[PDB]
Amino acid sequence: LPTWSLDSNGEMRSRLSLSEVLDSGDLMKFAVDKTGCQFLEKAVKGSLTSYQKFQLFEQVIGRKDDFLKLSTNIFGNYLVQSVIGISLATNDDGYTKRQEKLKNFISSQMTDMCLDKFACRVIQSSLQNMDLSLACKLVQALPRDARLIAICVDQNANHVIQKVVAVIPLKNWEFIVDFVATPEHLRQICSDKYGCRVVQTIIEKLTADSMNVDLTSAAQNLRERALQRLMTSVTNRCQELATNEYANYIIQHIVSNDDLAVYRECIIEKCLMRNLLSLSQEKFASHVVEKAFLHAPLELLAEMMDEIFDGYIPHPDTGKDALDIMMFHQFGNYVVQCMLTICCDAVSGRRQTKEGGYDHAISFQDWLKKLHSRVTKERHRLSRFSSGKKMIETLANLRS
RNA sequence: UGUACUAUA
């Protein structure tokens, strides 16, 4: 810190005015210092005369180099966001040029700022607060190659894409949907903890739920097509995504969401069916299997049940049949508990059995009877384990 | 008895 601003202790003075700082030419030094930053933080929140604003505009967002320097700074990025806020609230003759310049600084260094832990905050702030038409120019400056993937998988940068999805109209970011939907890109992005969050947010924004009822017909159609292209790519890699440590959450979301019912049935039919036994024994996919049992339409649910109950094991090395393998498996046991709870819920009225005016009560009673007979014959083995005890308990609880 | 994310003074 400049010596003039210090006292006898080598400590920042008291009674310091914002104008002193602005006039000194030493603003950059206060802005990257913890204590200076906090003085500025409070100073910039108060009443500001026109020249105080003018000096902030010039020194904080007026020159590219000092702009970039503050934006990438642990303390300075906050001052930048404040001054941007004040600039957008100040409708004098300089409003347009200030905003245009800001748009040019960020655009020219888009990738670098997005990837930076601190500058990515300036970007998010700018996307939210600039006039939409200029925020759209920032989106347009996003890279379209491997750098876009790196943004998506970065713990900080991914939040830039999320901000875009939240505050920018689909038309302007439609290229992101198709970028992501490219098979190799989807592969990389969904195999990553942060990338998955990006895909998830995109899916939600593209969903025709209560948050999108304000769209025009034409805009609904644009959203509908984008979703359909993304889901095609997602469902093409469905087994890989469902068994993946991160992307299983995305598959679960699609399966669990009634507003994505058509895509849920696609996933169940083309990916889960005929693979229930093996998927049930996987750490990650077992969770997708539970969601599928819970949310499948009754016609598919009956096929899933049949697949388990009539599951022929060519060479039984881990148990005589699918039910037997799953009940005593470390992950599969959860799938069976799920099947059981569903049946008990059906038979006891806690779940609808009548889908679309037609009543599958008799099928639930049949499945429950099979499970009851199996648990009865196996009670001695099952009672050795917590999962077995829970099933025995679920059944005992039903008798009442 | 079995998984993620929720990121700066």
Swiss-Prot record:
All residue ranges annotated as the PUM-HD domain in the record: 1-399
Taxon lineage: Eukaryota, Metazoa, Ecdysozoa, Nematoda, Chromadorea
UniProt Pumilio repeat ranges: 20-58, 59-97, 104-140, 141-165, 178-217, 233-269, 271-306, 317-354
Protein name (record): Fem-3 mRNA-binding factor 2
Other known facts: Fbf-1 and fbf-2 are >90% identical on both nucleotide and protein sequence level. Experimental approaches often do not distinguish between the two genes, which are collectively referred to as fbf and are considered to be functionally redundant.
GO CC, one annotated term: cytoplasm
Listed result of changing R121W: Broadens binding specificity at specific nucleotide positions in the RNA target
Function: RNA-binding protein that binds to the consensus sequence 5'-UGUGCCAUA-3' in mRNA 3'-UTRs. Involved in the control of stem cells and sex determination in the C.elegans hermaphrodite germline. May also play a role in the hermaphrodite germline proliferation and oogenesis. By binding to the 3'-UTR, represses phosphatase lip-1 expression in the distal part of the germline mitotic zone. Binds specifically to the regulatory region of fem-3 3'-UTR and mediates the sperm/oocyte switch. Negatively regulates gld-3 expression possibly by directly binding to two sites within the gld-3 isoform b 3'-UTR.
UniProt-reported outcome of changing I313A: Does not affect binding to lst-1
GO biological process: cell differentiation; negative regulation of translation; post-transcriptional regulation of gene expression; sex differentiation
Shown chain mapped onto the complete sequence: 168 to 567 of 632
Entry's localization field: Cytoplasm; Cytoplasmic granule
GO function term, MF aspect, one: mRNA 3'-UTR binding
Impact reported for C196S: Retains binding to 9 nt target RNA
Key words of the record: Cytoplasm, Developmental protein, Differentiation, Repeat, RNA-binding, Sexual differentiation
Gene name of the record: fbf-2
